[PDB]
Amino acid sequence: PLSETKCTLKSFTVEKGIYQTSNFRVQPTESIVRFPNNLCPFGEVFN
Amino acid sequence: VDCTMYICGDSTECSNLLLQYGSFCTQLNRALTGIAVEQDKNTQEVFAQ
Fold it and tell me: What spatial distance separates the first Cα and last Cα of chain A, rounded to whole Å?
C-alpha cells in the first residue's frame, strides 16, 4: 500500500503528509439465489 | 467520489472503457480533493487564529 501512492505522485520523493491511494472494496463471498417456498404434473402425465 | 465505482458499478466491462477517457476519472478526485483539502483551511484560519 505504500508503493501504490508513489505511483500517484509519480515521484520517488514523497513529501511529509497524507496521500490518497486507490480505493479498496470488500468482495463477495458467495451468491445467494432465493425463490419463494407450483409443480408441473409430470408425475401425472408420465406415470 | 470514486469515479471508477460511481460510473461503472463494480464491473470491469465498464471499467475498461473508462480507461479510454483518461484523466477524467482521476482529475475529478484531484478537483474534489482540491476542495476538501482547503475546506479545512477555511476552518483553520477562521477559528484558529
Answer: 65
- Alpha carbon B35 to chain centroid, angstroms: 10
Please answer whether residues A25 and B10 qualify as being in contact, where contact means their C-beta atoms are separated by less than 8 angstroms. Answer: yes
C-alpha radius of gyration, chain B, whole number: 16
Sort out which chain A residues have CB atoms less than 8 A from B2's CB and list them.
Answer: 23
Q: CB pairs below 8 Å between A and B: how many?
A: 7
Say if CB B3 and CB B28 are below 8 A apart.
yes
Experimental approach was cryo-EM
List of residues 6+ apart from A23 with CB closer than 8 A: B2, B4, B5
What is the stated resolution of the deposited model, in angstroms?
Answer: 3.8
Q: Say whether A20 and B2 touch across the interface (CB within 8 A).
A: no
